[PDB]
Curated annotation (Swiss-Prot), chain A:
The chain holds residues 128 to 363 of 507 of the full protein. Contains FG repeats. O-glycosylated. Component of the p62 complex, a complex composed of NUP62, NUP54, and the isoform p58 and isoform p45 of NUP58. Interacts with NUTF2. It is found in: Nucleus, Nuclear pore complex; Nucleus membrane. This is Nucleoporin p54. The gene is NUP54. Component of the nuclear pore complex, a complex required for the trafficking across the nuclear membrane. It is linked to Dystonia 37, early-onset, with striatal lesions: A form of dystonia, a disorder defined by the presence of sustained involuntary muscle contraction, often leading to abnormal postures. DYT37 is an autosomal recessive form characterized by the onset of progressive dystonia, dysphagia, and choreoathetosis in the first months or years of life. Affected individuals show delayed motor development and may have impaired intellectual development. Belongs to the NUP54 family.
From Swiss-Prot, chain B:
It comes from the Eukaryota. O-glycosylated. Contains about 10 N-acetylglucosamine side chain sites predicted for the entire protein, among which only one in the C-terminal. This is Nuclear pore glycoprotein p62. It is linked to Infantile striatonigral degeneration: Neurological disorder characterized by symmetrical degeneration of the caudate nucleus, putamen, and occasionally the globus pallidus, with little involvement of the rest of the brain. The clinical features include developmental regression, choreoathetosis, dystonia, spasticity, dysphagia, failure to thrive, nystagmus, optic atrophy, and intellectual disability. Essential component of the nuclear pore complex. The N-terminal is probably involved in nucleocytoplasmic transport. The C-terminal is involved in protein-protein interaction probably via coiled-coil formation, promotes its association with centrosomes and may function in anchorage of p62 to the pore complex. Plays a role in mitotic cell cycle progression by regulating centrosome segregation, centriole maturation and spindle orientation. It might be involved in protein recruitment to the centrosome after nuclear breakdown. The gene is NUP62. The chain holds residues 334 to 366 of 522 of the full protein. It is found in: Nucleus, Nuclear pore complex; Cytoplasm, Cytoskeleton, Spindle pole; Nucleus envelope; Cytoplasm, Cytoskeleton, Microtubule organizing center, Centrosome. It comes from Homo sapiens. Contains FG repeats. Belongs to the nucleoporin NSP1/NUP62 family.
UniProtKB/Swiss-Prot annotation, chain C:
Residues 6-26 form a coiled coil. The chain holds residues 251 to 300 of 599 of the full protein. Belongs to the NUP58 family. Transmembrane segments: none annotated. O-glycosylated. Component of the p62 complex, a complex at least composed of NUP62, NUP54, and NUP58. Interacts with NUTF2. Interacts with SRP1-alpha and Importin p97 proteins when they are together, but not with SRP1-alpha protein alone. It comes from Homo sapiens (Human). It is found in: Nucleus, Nuclear pore complex; Nucleus membrane. Component of the nuclear pore complex, a complex required for the trafficking across the nuclear membrane. This is Nucleoporin p58/p45. Contains FG repeats. FG repeats are interaction sites for karyopherins (importins, exportins) and form probably an affinity gradient, guiding the transport proteins unidirectionally with their cargo through the NPC. FG repeat regions are highly flexible and lack ordered secondary structure. The overall conservation of FG repeats regarding exact sequence, spacing, and repeat unit length is limited. In rat, the p62 complex contains two different isoforms of NUP58. Isoform p45 has however not been isolated in human so far.
Length: 205, 33, 50
């Protein structure tokens, strides 16, 4: 029956799986566990022995507040001299709730120049998170299950390539998604604008 | 075929809308940057 | 088959709910912003001219 396939197409249409996704396809341009992997230029035996000290040192880099706790997911010995340590940090809220710091945020903190130098003093040569060129790095090779010819074309179609890269968007909740971010975003804009405003008031006063 | 009909037109109707909304958000993001 | 339409219309409609959900969610917060930065920029010109 011709009848059943229309049904199928329609079912196909309304779905997160992406077979001509309900013709939900839309691409929005996004500007471009909490596990972090650290590589130390130290022997594994040394790392494990000293590890209590090492954990605390990392804690210190964070600021050493009681709220944050460093946890070691595990250690491995990549070369004789180098060891890989994976860690995640738990943060506690004022209401006693606790959750892991996001990998991206944690990574960003470590990457900062001041933090990075301190980390290096520890012997941490390189860091990585599981989640220039690098754009080039991700935008090609395609994403989520998005078709390669469409993904291409969002790249050509992109109105504003440094400020932006093509980011796959997925039907309604995804727009919901975007909006949640927008709001997230909105509050921080408003605030920073307030900070400028306060500094200007101080200067004028 | 009363029903299937209902499906498509609802589908295209919402689709035409979803399209416009995504766009909104695009234009809003727009304005954000 | 008519188990069937009980579900599909149901998953489809479940989805329209989300569509409503986004519809409920809409901006003024956003509109607000350009006005403010346009305004803050101006006070900065003040302070500067001062």
């Amino acid at each position: 029956t011709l009848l059943g396939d229309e049904r199928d197409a329609i079912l196909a249409k309304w779905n997160q799986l992406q077979a001509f996704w309900g013709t939900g396809k839309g691409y929005f341009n996004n500007n471009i566990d909490g596990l972090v992997v650290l590589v130390f230029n130290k022997k594994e035996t040394e790392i494990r022995s000293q590890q209590q000290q090492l954990v605390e040192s990392l804690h210190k880099v964070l600021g050493g507040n009681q709220t944050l706790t460093v946890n070691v997911e595990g250690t491995k010995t990549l070369p004789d001299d180098q060891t890989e340590v994976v860690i995640y940090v738990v943060e506690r809220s004022p209401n006693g709730t606790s959750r892991r710091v996001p990998a991206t945020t944690l990574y960003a903190h470590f990457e900062q120049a001041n933090i990075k130098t301190q980390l290096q003093q520890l012997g941490v040569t390189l860091s990585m998170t599981r989640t220039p060129a690098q754009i080039k790095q991700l935008l090609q090779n395609p994403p989520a299950g998005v078709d390669p010819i469409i993904w291409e074309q969002a790249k050509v179609d992109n109105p504003d390539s440094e400020k932006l890269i093509p980011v796959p968007m997925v039907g309604f909740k995804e727009l919901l998604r975007r909006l949640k971010v927008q709001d997230q975003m909105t509050k921080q804009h408003q605030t920073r604008l307030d900070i400028i405003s306060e500094d200007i008031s101080e200067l004028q006063k | 075929e009363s029903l299937i009909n209902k499906w498509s037109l609802e589908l295209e109707d919402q689709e035409r809308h979803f399209l416009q909304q995504a766009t909104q958000v695009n234009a809003w993001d727009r304005t954000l940057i | 088959i008519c188990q069937d339409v009980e579900n599909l219309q149901k998953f489809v409609k479940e989805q329209k709910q989300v569509q409503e959900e986004i519809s409920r969610m809409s901006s003024k917060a956003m509109l607000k912003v350009q006005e403010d930065i346009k305004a803050l920029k101006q006070l900065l010109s003040l302070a500067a001219n001062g």
